[PDB]
Nucleic acid binder design. Structure first.
Lengths: 77, 76, 77, 76
DNA sequence: ATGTGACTTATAGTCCGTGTGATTATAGTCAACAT
DNA sequence: ATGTTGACTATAATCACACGGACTATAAGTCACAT
């Protein structure tokens, strides 16, 4: 569907595994539904900047380093 | 409101201006509503990635250039 | 399958709803997985007395009270 | 160990005796292993409902009578 | 008769994830009128 | 030109649940040898 979305959803998962988190921890720490974290990674889903922020806080990661990894993923072949 | 959401909006407005675009024209170029655009720039909207993407295409700016800018703006 | 199991299964759910609990709450307080609580209610799984005991403690109900409702459900038409 | 588990077992042993059965015979009647039964009666086993059901069949006691008894036993 | 121990094998119970209908909050989109 | 106020309607986001596969702990079932 959307170019950027699958990149965002890819990076959320990448970080989540890097930090040895599971989906449902992240769902807690991000103060969003269990199934939403799944749905974001699983398919992609069209999240909101506010929701993205919540997830970033949950990944225990800064806006900045998130976007830095986002850029790197976009740039790949 | 949100810090990120504010910086996003600021960035959208910044790029629109360094390109000498009007809102009217930013909305024409991305096929969204001008009041919608207005709203974002006065930070009254919490856009989705999809929408953000349409706005980048309307600004004629790559995802990467946008985020490069968004990062810099984020750091005061 | 087993006669007693689906009865035990039924009564666990009945109580759980009577107390306005959700599976999530229950598996919570029973310190079992929410998958297992679901599994039990769903497909009448074959639990252990120890696990049943945990569920009773989770339902905030006593041995006695449970077995009294168990007897009732068995007796029904 | 568990409180319930001990009284299940106690009950199983109680009924086997009130009937005049040996373990050997409770095992035969319920098509289970004798050491299996001995284990339960010394309370070294944590039955599943299914197993309990087989032991009730062997004792020839309905679920209801078993639980009526277990309750009474439970209340000291 | 019953009670051990110790040793496989079935399965109970765990852990992480997928996929889904139904409801609620809210973004997406477009009016009217402002300046 | 841009701002703001309601609106309607799509959909983001929530909530309670089912379902699967893979792995770990342990109950199920059977030996040998006590007594």
């Amino acid at each position: 569907e959307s170019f950027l979305l699958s990149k965002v959803s890819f990076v959320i998962k990448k970080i989540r595994l890097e930090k040895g988190m599971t989906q449902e921890d992240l769902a807690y720490k991000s103060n969003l539904d269990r199934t939403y974290i799944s749905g974001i990674e699983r398919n992609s889903r069209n999240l909101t900047i506010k929701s993205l922020e919540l997830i970033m806080k949950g990944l225990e990661v800064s806006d900045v380093v998130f976007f830095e990894m986002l850029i790197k993923e976009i740039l790949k072949h």
